[PDB]
């Protein structure tokens, strides 16, 4: 179903998702490579322990986008809702407000 | 104005290669989906143009039903770095949930 | 001639053509070193447009 | 080209000096009982810059000290401080305080008894 | 600390909360008025002097409610007047709190008729709303601006009537008396009436607000009102020092103020409080009853400038805090609209024009460059002046920036133009720029920063203490953390304000010091006013009198404790505290069980880094400014007699 | 260690604050409510000259500070790799200098050996300053002994002190700076030490992320300005100290700046006269 | 508890005049324990406040602040300090000139 995962490539090991995991579940854990300041520490979801409660992902807490949700049909969601894509331009008026 | 459109962490809109099936035997079953998760697209030539231009960023998950290894063009001289075509490059997201407790 | 005199009283009004950052800088210059420093700012930028 | 970096830095320092001089003329102040109004603003600007420059070069040199420090500095680091400290002490005797500060006569006030006998001049 | 969030409350709830708070505040005003009653209406001696009433005694005597007259007669009358006005404030505050409860509970049913009016649709005051509004603001704060302007016009009109009739100050044009405040009360009515009508007929538009904007409108208006407070502080400082205000602020110096906590008539140890009490022991100063609070002359205390400084710094601190809070709450709104995606959909300059990250970077870089330049200039000037006055490196005061007065075109702002005023102005600009670095970071880098958009990270939670040691450390990167840093940076501009208004010589750290030429500034710079000692020696001189007061000494110790307690939470110690608190829990458990069979099942709580930063900044600010209160409440202690040359 | 430290610290600090309250006569409490009767016992009096509450507070403050710093020293000794909490939370300390783990479990700042050393130094600043103020002749039993307020200047009379101590804790700064300001070099040390000490806050405070995010802006501003009005020049990155280096530098600055000035306390003078003042009747 | 009065029995101290050698240590430890209790009450009660403070009060909490400050001033006048220092004779000094006159006295 939900089957929330973490992209180890992008995790920064902040742990903002770990605190949301229910205390007994504790599926999310810390994996250390070395030299914490160099980014060795990372986040992993033990899929066996996960109970698809959505607390980790629905929190909107992942800064890197590593925390993803694979929908039952299958689609990776990096966020609960990404902002719409826009074609932007600076509206500078001609005469009155912001000329040129 | 570009960082505030879409996810602010991806300068180029990211497209995970979620589903691919060998049964259709054409590999058109490759079904790219953006990180937003609202468009189950396909690897069309326009998507190829976007990928080469750098507008998009196609990615692959490790934990999934296998997309196509050596059946969708693969470079294995180094660690595998799957490519739709040699000029393309599907950077595989690595996902170590099983190897670690 | 209107732009330069409006500038000498209202420099940021003169640089209104320029970017919002330049307009804010000229406003701050009015606030600090009013006229001389900010009049310098407006004359530099306007002469540069020329 | 770093020539433009030094050009901009020296131009900025020169412009600071010129601005200080000009505003000193603008700001109406009685110069001093003796000192002039041409040199005093420049003395203040010399202090200003020398302070900023000394702090900047100290910061930069200590950063490059941390960058270049190695085991090969085994004798280069300690002895250098030694010599500088030595120089400092010598600079105290020959330049800053030239003597022991005896009286004008040269009586060498060196005990509290004679200090008491001195401070109460008739 | 988020229970009364803007989202949690609707417009009627906010109306009711503000109304109930106005009533509570009216009760506080009555309390202060009663605290000001030196002699009771019944004849007996009354309350001593409190800063809470010495702050408003000038204004109260301006309105004739209080009197600077010193006989028991007419001071009894002033006390009766203060009691009457305090009772009026009490009852009106009761009514205001009743209305606030009704609005908060939405039970806007008339107790007499029972008709339940609608916040959305309501005729104002009856027929007046029909004449003017023709029907209420169907919705929208924009349609409410005009009605609020009309309400403020009616407030101005009512104050004009009250001062004309109740307090007996007729409207007279001349601006040297309270009478003008009546005149202008009517003027600002018509203005804030007419404009209101205009804004009722032609509403204004800033579409960022009006939509889901209790926080957004609150932020903008809080920043605006913080600048209003800063302007009010400057105006108060200028005006209260003008001759027209001397009858109400300069005449404080002629009075003697018995303030709580001031020196009390001491008694020997062998003292018995029976009858005359003389036989047992000797009191410190005879003619005053034992333990009585001894008189303090306002001339020495400088109560005119003390009260002026307290009011001015109250408004300045409140305004700076309000600016910082407005930028913070606006940053919270910005982050909300960035997360939900409305940021790109806003079509107003206040959001669109800074949409580009390039312009945000350029703005913050300009602010940072100006801050570097001005801070370096002022600090070089100050340290060089210190090097000269202390004669360090062989220097002398002649090399100091005594010549660097504000230009003749800017000496009008300053009574005695010297290098002190130059350093004041430039230090204020530099502190403003410093705090603006953090404020601009909140404004722009609320959801993503150029480092973070390069580093592939986004700021979501608006309170997350960090993202960890990734990239060498991500401490204090939320907008809340930037607000805390902005407050800790504005501490310094606010200090500069305090030290300037209390008479300090902020151009050098060691003015008035008994060393080298520190006491020569008055001769070389030709100063008229003898500024209180410099930045480092100002502590000493002001503590000469802080230490002489038991109450001010208690404040000193308490604020210092509060300040240094802040490091336990601000320092990078949270993990150490968590580990130690686990050890504390285990210690309590086993020690208690061995000492007492009862089990504990309780854990010592450790603040999160977010709460740690919140409490740490609160404590830092609290200690710092509870002590600035001592600086401003010791006395002005700046005399108009320059010190001769040291030799 | 924690319990002994809590008991000693709470008792001695309560003694100090109570003596301060009685000094100031806050809450109407005259000086006789103070612990002028707390003196070193006739068994341990020989360790001190003029035994009084100052000596008792000295002994107990030293014990409390030693046990305080010993909390962190013992944490270094034992909880170098695994702590009971970090074991329960299933985490390992793989380095002596690792700054933290992250915003996980509410924060994990300063859990390493190096950070515990820094906290040990910061805590032992108290014991060392107590030593300095005892040796230079201060009244550490109260905050404002000798203050010209209330009954404080009656201490010598109430405690029968044979020597006049320079001042209480808070008043010690003032009375011992009367002579620092009279000296130019000591004043330079004062200013420089305070500069160093407060600059320690830039790194010790939880602000590394802010400084990093701002150094990015500094780099971009340098490039843009060096390209705009300076012509055709762009390079250089503004460095920012990591949290480990930030903590190290902050501890160095804190310790030096506080002990750049303790030297001033000890180098301005003993100033502990042996003529006790009369009662302030 | 009763350790400090035994300390006072030891640690030979010359009791201050007109104060009992037993009650003076009793008063000292009394104030010590009063401070400890006041700190405990402050900490635990503010913890309970933070745990219990909610939208449900909205005015009884500001009204509690109002009543506590009112009784603060009320205790200032009624119990702590009475009258504006008046004078043993009874005359009040309210001008700087009168204070200078009494300084001359
Ligand atoms: C400190 C620096 C900033 C500041 C920083 C923050 C931060 C940080 C936060 C808020 C939050 C809020 N702020 Mg703010 N804000 C400032 C100024 C203001 C002002 C103003 C005076 O004009 C207002 C109206 C607000 C309004 C608000 C709300 C929109 C919101 C929720 C508050 C509430 O429910 O808290 C409930 C608690 C309160 C009532 C305040 C605490 C005071 C107590 C209850 C007062 C009475 C007791 C006693 C007298 C004093 C306290 C100490 C005693 C020992 C008990 N801020 C100051 C100047 N603000 C929070 C929010 O959720 O943001 C979305 C939040 O996280
Ligand atoms: C002077 C004009 C100021 C202003 C001054 C204040 C002050 C001051 C306060 C508020 C408060 C509130 N303000 Mg406001 N407010 C302004 C404009 C706005 C606007 C707007 C423009 O539409 C909005 C939407 C708000 C929004 C709000 C709510 C968050 C809250 C009222 C709800 C209520 O009382 O909860 C029900 C809550 C209760 C009645 C409990 C109150 C408890 C105690 C008595 C007060 C708590 C806060 C603190 C002690 C006050 C500190 C002031 C400092 C001394 C600087 N403000 C401008 C910027 N506003 C209050 C609030 O709750 O702050 C957190 C508050 O105290
Ligand atoms: C101090 C009193 C409080 C207060 C307490 C009450 C009480 C109590 C009641 C209401 C009722 C109502 N309130 Mg109210 N309310 C206040 C301010 C407001 C404001 C505002 C202008 O910001 C709004 C939007 C409202 C909204 C409303 C209406 C929905 C409703 C009246 C319907 C109507 O046709 O009435 C026409 C008149 C109104 C719109 C009232 C406007 C507010 C005036 C100032 C109330 C004054 C009451 C006071 C005792 C009398 C003094 C009059 C002197 C001339 C000063 N109130 C004032 C400041 N409100 C009333 C009700 O339900 O009416 C059917 C009601 O009984
Ligand atoms: C000027 C009158 C008001 C004001 C009215 C508003 C309004 C209205 C809005 C904001 C909003 C915001 N305000 Mg404001 N605000 C003021 C003071 C400040 C100060 C400050 C310390 O001076 C700061 C840091 C902020 C910060 C902020 C942000 C939280 C937010 C904009 C984010 C963004 O993306 O901006 C993008 C960056 C910019 C648009 C940069 C350019 C600035 C604009 C064009 C105008 C000022 C410059 C002017 C032309 C200068 C030259 C002439 C001089 C006037 C002499 N305000 C004063 C008190 N503010 C918005 C917000 O969302 O509120 C919640 C909003 O709706
Ligand atoms: C209730 C009484 C007071 C007190 C009264 C005194 C007095 C008075 C003196 C000391 C002395 C000492 N106390 Mg003690 N002491 C208190 C609390 C403590 C605590 C603590 C658990 O917090 C500790 C660790 C200490 C430790 C110490 C040393 C600092 C000091 C050196 C000799 C020694 O210990 O001799 C005794 C050593 C032991 C019995 C074993 C080790 C320490 C034990 C754990 C605690 C000793 C205090 C004990 C209660 C005293 C009983 C004597 C009373 C006068 C009846 N005290 C309490 C608050 N203590 C002496 C000192 O040097 O004075 C300058 C001294 O004369
Ligand atoms: C008055 C000031 C301080 C204390 C009081 C104190 C007490 C204390 N601290 Mg602290 N601290 C700083 C100030 C004070 N820290 C500073 C300025 C820094 C910046 C570096 C700092 C830093 C760290 C780190 C990094 C760690 C700790 C801990 C830790 C404790 C848990 C157990 C213990 O140590 O008990 C030993 C400590 C005692 C029980 C102290 C005895 C009470 C006192 C006599 C009186 C209390 C007065 C009161 C605070 C005033 C108002 C109260 C009321 C009226 C509202 C613990 C009770 C840590 C632990 O949990 O591990 C042991 C940990 O890891 N800290
Ligand atoms: C003298 C003491 C201090 C500075 C000097 C300074 C300088 C500075 N700081 Mg600081 N800081 C504190 C003290 C000082 N912080 C404290 C006590 C706290 C505890 C809360 C604290 C905390 C934060 C946070 C949280 C952040 C920052 C920044 C940030 C800057 C980058 C942008 C800027 O301000 O440029 C504007 C340029 C100036 C501020 C530099 C002009 C120098 C002047 C002439 C004083 C010279 C000092 C000394 C004489 C140097 C020795 C030379 C020789 C003897 C070896 C930046 C230059 C941050 C940024 O990068 O954000 C954009 C950020 O996020 N901070
Ligand atoms: C505390 C002293 C400052 C030191 C602060 C350090 C600066 C950052 C240093 C990096 C910090 C760091 O982290 O790393 C250190 C790293 O160092 C090294 O790298 C280098 C890049 C080579 C260091 C050299 C940088 C530079 C050349 C030196 C510094 C830059 C300099 C030149 C600073 C000074 C600039 C100036 C003077 C600023 C001020 C200039 C602007 C002013 C005064 C405005 C005037 C206003 C005008 C227009 C008129 C005014 C007016 C008005 C308004 C009204 C009326 C009237 C009448 C008037 C006159 C190693 O390689 C690495 O190993 C090591 O790590
Ligand atoms: C204004 C701010 C509002 C409130 C914030 C103010 C606030 O939160 O304080 C700041 C800070 C509390 O932060 P923490 O999260 O580290 O508190 C954990 C506590 O349980 C102490 O370990 O206090 C300090 O650490 C210094 C004072 C602690 C002194 C209390 C002593 C506690 C004794 C516990 C038992 C010790 C015995 C040891 C047994 C082994
Ligand atoms: C500008 C020159 C940029 C400098 C430039 O282009 O690069 C020169 C230098 C570093 O550049 P690099 O030497 O690494 O670049 C190598 C190239 O120059 C070789 O082509 O700038 C620094 O980063 C200095 C760091 C402290 C610099 C502090 C500058 C603060 C000045 C702020 C005051 C401005 C006054 C205006 C306010 C009124
Ligand atoms: S969905 Fe729930 S149980 Fe699963 S990893 Fe996320 S928070 Fe843990
Ligand atoms: S030191 Fe503390 S605040 Fe900084 S990144 Fe580590 S856990 Fe976060
Ligand atoms: Ca000494």
């Amino acid at each position: 179903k939900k089957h929330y995962f973490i992209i180890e490539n992008l995790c920064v090991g902040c742990g903002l998702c770990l605190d949301k995991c229910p205390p007994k579940v504790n599926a999310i854990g810390y994996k250390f490579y070395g030299d914490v300041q160099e980014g060795g520490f990372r986040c992993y979801i033990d899929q066996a322990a996960c109970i698809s409660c959505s607390a980790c992902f629905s929190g909107d807490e992942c800064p890197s986008g590593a925390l993803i949700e694979v929908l039952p049909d299958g689609e990776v969601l990096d966020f609960s809702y990404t902002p719409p894509e826009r074609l932007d331009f600076d509206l500078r008026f001609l005469h009155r407000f912001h000329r040129e | 104005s570009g960082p505030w459109s879409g996810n602010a962490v991806h300068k180029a809109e990211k497209y995970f290669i979620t589903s691919a099936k060998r049964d259709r035997d054409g590999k058109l079953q490759i079904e790219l989906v953006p990180a937003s998760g609202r468009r189950k697209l396909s690897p069309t030539p326009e998507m190829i143009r976007r990928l080469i231009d750098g507008e998009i960023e196609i990615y692959i998950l490790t934990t999934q039903p296998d997309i196509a290894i050596d059946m969708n063009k693969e470079i294995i001289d180094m660690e595998n770095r799957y490519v739709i075509d040699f000029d393309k490059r599907g950077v595989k997201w690595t996902m170590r949930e099983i190897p670690v407790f | 001639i209107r732009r330069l005199i409006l500038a000498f009283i209202l420099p940021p009004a003169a640089v209104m053509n320029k970017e919002a950052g330049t307009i804010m800088l000229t406003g701050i210059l009015t606030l600090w070193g009013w006229i001389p420093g900010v009049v310098a700012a407006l004359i530099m930028i306007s002469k540069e447009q020329s | 080209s770093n020539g433009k970096l030094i050009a901009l830095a020296v131009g900025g320092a020169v412009l600071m000096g010129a601005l200080f001089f000009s505003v000193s003329f603008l700001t109406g102040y009685i110069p001093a009982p003796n000192h002039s109004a041409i040199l005093t603003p420049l003395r203040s600007f010399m202090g200003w810059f020398l302070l900023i420059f000394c702090a900047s070069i100290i910061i930069m040199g200590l950063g490059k000290m941390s960058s270049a420090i190695s085991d090969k500095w085994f004798l280069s680091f300690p002895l250098s401080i030694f010599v500088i400290v030595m120089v400092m002490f010598l600079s105290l005797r020959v330049y800053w305080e030239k003597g022991r500060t005896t009286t004008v006569d040269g009586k060498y006030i060196r005990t509290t008894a004679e200090l008491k006998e001195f401070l109460n001049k008739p | 600390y988020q229970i009364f969030d803007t989202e949690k409350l609707d417009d009627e709830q906010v109306v009711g909360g503000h109304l109930a708070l106005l009533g509570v505040l009216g009760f506080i005003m009555g309390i202060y008025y009663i605290s000001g009653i030196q002699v009771f209406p019944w004849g007996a001696p009354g309350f001593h002097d409190n800063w809470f009433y010495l702050t408003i005694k000038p204004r109260m005597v301006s309105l004739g409610i209080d009197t600077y007259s010193t006989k028991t007669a007419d001071l009894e009358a002033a006390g009766a007047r203060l009691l009457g006005w305090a009772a009026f404030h009490f009852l009106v505050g009761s009514v205001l709190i009743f209305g606030g409860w009704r609005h908060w509970t939405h039970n806007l049913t008339n107790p007499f008729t029972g008709r339940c009016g609608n916040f959305r649709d309501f005729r104002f005051l009856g027929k007046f709303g029909d004449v003017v509004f023709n029907g209420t603001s169907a919705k929208s704060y924009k349609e409410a601006l005009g009605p609020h302007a009309v309400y403020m016009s009616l407030l101005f009109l009512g104050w004009g009537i009250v001062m004309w009739a109740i307090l007996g100050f007729a409207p007279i044009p001349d601006f040297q008396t309270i009478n003008s405040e009546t005149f202008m009360s009517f003027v600002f009515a018509v203005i804030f009436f007419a404009l209101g009508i205009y804004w009722w007929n032609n509403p204004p538009n800033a579409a960022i607000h009006l939509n889901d904007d209790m926080k957004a409108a609150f932020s903008v208006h809080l920043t605006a009102i913080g600048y209003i407070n800063i302007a009010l502080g400057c105006i108060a400082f200028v005006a209260f020092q003008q001759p027209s205000f001397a009858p109400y602020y300069k005449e404080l110096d002629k009075l003697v103020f018995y303030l709580y906590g001031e020196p009390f008539n001491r008694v020997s140890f062998n003292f018995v409080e029976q009858g005359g009490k003389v036989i047992s022991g000797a009191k410190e100063f005879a003619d005053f009853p034992a333990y009585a609070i001894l008189p303090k002359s306002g001339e020495a205390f400088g109560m005119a400038r003390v009260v002026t400084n307290l009011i001015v710094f109250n408004h300045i601190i409140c305004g700076v805090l309000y600016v910082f809070a407005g930028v913070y709450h606006g940053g919270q709104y910005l982050l909300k609209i960035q997360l939900n995606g409305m940021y790109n959909q806003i079509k107003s300059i206040w959001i669109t024009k800074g949409r580009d990250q390039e312009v945000q970077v350029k703005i913050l870089g300009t602010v940072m460059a100006l801050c570097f330049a001005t801070m370096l200039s002022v600090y070089a000037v100050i340290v060089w002046n210190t090097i000269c006055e202390l004669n360090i490196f062989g220097t002398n005061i002649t090399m100091s920036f005594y010549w660097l007065k504000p230009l003749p075109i800017f000496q009008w702002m300053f009574a005695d133009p010297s290098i002190n005023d130059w350093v004041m102005a430039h230090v204020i600009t530099a502190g403003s720029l410093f705090s603006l670095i953090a404020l601009v970071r909140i404004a722009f880098f609320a959801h993503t920063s150029p480092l973070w958009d390069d580093l592939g990270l986004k700021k979501n939670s608006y309170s997350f203490p960090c993202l960890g040691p990734v990239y060498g450390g991500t401490c204090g990167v939320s907008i809340q953390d930037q607000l805390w840093f902005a407050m800790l940076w504005g501490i310094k501009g606010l200090s500069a304000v305090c030290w300037y208004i209390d008479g300090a010589w902020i151009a050098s750290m060691m003015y008035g010091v008994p060393a080298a030429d520190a006491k020569a500034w008055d001769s070389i710079a030709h100063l008229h006013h003898h500024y209180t000692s410099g930045i480092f020696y100002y502590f000493w001189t002001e503590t000469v009198t802080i230490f002489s007061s038991s109450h001010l000494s208690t404040i000193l110790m308490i604020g210092h404790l509060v300040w240094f307690i802040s490091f336990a939470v601000w320092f990078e110690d949270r993990g150490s505290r968590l580990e130690g608190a686990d050890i504390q829990t285990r210690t309590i458990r086993w020690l208690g069980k061995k000492f007492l069979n009862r089990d504990v099942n309780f854990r010592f709580p450790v603040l999160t880094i977010s709460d740690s930063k919140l409490a740490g900044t609160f404590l830092y600010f609290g200690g710092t400014f509870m002590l600035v209160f001592l600086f401003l409440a010791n006395g002005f202690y700046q005399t108009n007699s320059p010190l001769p040359p040291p030799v």
Side-chain angles (χ1 to χ4, degrees), chain E residues 3-4 8 16-17 20 24 27-28 31-32 35 38-40 43 45-50 52 70-72 75 97 100-101 104 253-258 260 269 272 283 287-289 291-299:
Chain E
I3 52 170
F4 305 119
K8 291 169 189 51
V24 170
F27 283 108
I28 304 314
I31 291 163
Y32 297 166
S35 166
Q38 294 176 353
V39 296
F40 278 119
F47 308 83
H48 304 248
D49 290 335
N50 313 68
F52 296 82
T70 52
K71 313 161 296 320
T72 318
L75 254 185
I97 296 174
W101 183 237
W104 183 271
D253 302 349
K254 184 69 212 314
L255 324 177
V256 298
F257 300 89
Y258 308 79
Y260 294 106
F269 290 123
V272 168
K283 31 165 95 156
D287 88 353
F288 289 134
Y291 298 77
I293 310 185
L294 303 162
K296 180 50 165 159
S297 87
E299 295 197 6

Side-chain angles (χ1 to χ4, degrees), chain D residues 69-97:
Chain D
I69 183 73
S70 61
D71 289 342
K72 296 179 175 186
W73 284 36
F74 174 52
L75 265 44
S76 316
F77 187 60
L79 270 72
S80 69
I81 310 166
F82 151 72
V83 77
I84 206 169
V85 161
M86 193 172 55
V87 165
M88 283 186 76
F89 277 53
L90 290 159
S91 76
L92 285 169
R93 195 263 160 285
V94 307
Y95 178 43
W96 292 106
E97 300 275 1

